[PDB]
Write an enzyme that holds these catalytic residues in place. Structure first.
Site, PDB file in Angstrom:
ATOM      1  N   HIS A  69       0.639  -1.668  -0.100  1.00  0.00           N
ATOM      2  CA  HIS A  69      -0.338  -0.214   0.216  1.00  0.00           C
ATOM      3  C   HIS A  69       0.581   1.598  -0.502  1.00  0.00           C
ATOM      4  O   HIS A  69       0.342   2.089   0.564  1.00  0.00           O
ATOM      5  CB  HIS A  69      -1.159  -0.058   0.978  1.00  0.00           C
ATOM      6  CG  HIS A  69      -0.655  -0.202   2.186  1.00  0.00           C
ATOM      7  ND1 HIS A  69       0.139  -0.853   3.243  1.00  0.00           N
ATOM      8  CD2 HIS A  69      -0.126   1.265   3.036  1.00  0.00           C
ATOM      9  CE1 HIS A  69      -0.110   0.047   4.242  1.00  0.00           C
ATOM     10  NE2 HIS A  69       0.265   1.542   3.839  1.00  0.00           N
TER      11      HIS A  69
ATOM     12  N   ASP B 198       0.250  -7.478   1.291  1.00  0.00           N
ATOM     13  CA  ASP B 198       0.225  -6.336   1.592  1.00  0.00           C
ATOM     14  C   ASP B 198       1.980  -6.498   1.308  1.00  0.00           C
ATOM     15  O   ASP B 198       2.661  -5.305   1.968  1.00  0.00           O
ATOM     16  CB  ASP B 198      -0.007  -5.643   2.611  1.00  0.00           C
ATOM     17  CG  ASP B 198       0.114  -4.307   2.373  1.00  0.00           C
ATOM     18  OD1 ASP B 198       0.361  -3.629   1.514  1.00  0.00           O
ATOM     19  OD2 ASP B 198      -0.020  -3.585   3.491  1.00  0.00           O
TER      20      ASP B 198
ATOM     21  N   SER C 133       3.994   2.722   8.104  1.00  0.00           N
ATOM     22  CA  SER C 133       3.800   1.102   7.294  1.00  0.00           C
ATOM     23  C   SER C 133       5.046   0.114   6.554  1.00  0.00           C
ATOM     24  O   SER C 133       5.875   1.746   6.189  1.00  0.00           O
ATOM     25  CB  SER C 133       3.001   1.836   6.403  1.00  0.00           C
ATOM     26  OG  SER C 133       1.550   2.501   6.446  1.00  0.00           O
TER      27      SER C 133
END
Length: 263
Positions: A57, A113, A194
């Site tokens: 992402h 992801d 992230s």
């Protein structure tokens, strides 16, 4: 940079015993703007290839975006700021001058992801990098260690001393993500963290950060996050460009887990 005061500087005592894996983690920019975290991983050939795992992402899984990366190594506060005190929530003093630019995409996959990049430049000995081990076994752990750049600020460490569990992204029933419960007044993760790794107690990568409900003010089970699992990413999308196996075990040794490699 600035991040939540509940976060813990890596130079604090919580980093003792983890001084090798702290050196695997880097902050990076996408198209010039600070964006996410990623970290170096060892492979079964033990050859220091510059395999840098991060989150799909974050958007680096395309040739063009990957080419634009700048990684910032050793970006962390020079002194331990007491957690949960205003000092920890203040702008830090880390240096952003140990950098490298450019990478290529080895694989990316949206379900677990992950994105695995290979950085263009070989390790600069001056940076004293570390390539962390990984563990692809289908199991849970009694606790876990996160090393990350919250708000893409100075490097922090967050401890989990609760068992992990399996969930689907969003917390539903599933097995692609690991759910990690943070300590009630411990460090958490924030936007920018992230792509950061989660390690087992044995210091091996188990996944990378997808996101979750945590914040320094979160309570109960909301003080948690979800990591896309290496177990899932291992087979990934069914081909080398969407999985980890071809890159991490190029020697086809069959290893279920491996240890790290220093610089």
């Amino acid at each position: 940079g600035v991040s939540g005061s509940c976060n813990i500087d890596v130079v604090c005592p919580e980093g003792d015993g983890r001084r090798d894996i702290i050196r695997a983690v880097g902050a990076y920019s996408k198209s010039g703007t600070l964006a996410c975290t990623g970290s170096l991983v060892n492979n079964t050939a033990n050859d220091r290839k510059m395999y840098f795992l991060t989150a799909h992402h974050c958007g680096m899984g395309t040739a063009s975006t990957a080419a634009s990366i700048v990684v910032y190594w050793n970006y962390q506060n020079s002194t331990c700021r007491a957690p949960n005190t205003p000092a920890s929530g203040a702008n830090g003093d880390g240096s952003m001058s140990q950098t490298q630019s450019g990478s290529t995409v080895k694989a990316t996959y949206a379900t677990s992801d992950f994105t695995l990049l290979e950085l263009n430049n070989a390790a600069n000995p001056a940076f004293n990098l570390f390539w962390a081990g990984w563990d692809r076994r289908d199991q849970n752990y009694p606790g876990a260690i996160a090393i990350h750049h919250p708000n893409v600020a100075e490097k922090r460490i967050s401890n989990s001393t609760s068992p992990t569990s399996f969930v689907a992204w969003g917390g539903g029933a599933g097995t692609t993500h690991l759910n990690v419960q943070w300590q009630p007044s411990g460090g958490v993760t924030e936007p920018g963290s992230s792509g950061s790794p989660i390690y087992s107690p044995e210091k091996r990568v188990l996944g990378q950060l997808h996101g979750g409900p945590s914040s320094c003010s979160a309570t109960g089970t909301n003080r948690s996050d979800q990591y896309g699992r290496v177990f899932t990413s291992w087979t990934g999308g069914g081909a080398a460009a969407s999985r980890l196996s071809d890159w991490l075990d190029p020697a086809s040794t069959g290893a279920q887990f491996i240890d790290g490699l220093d610089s």
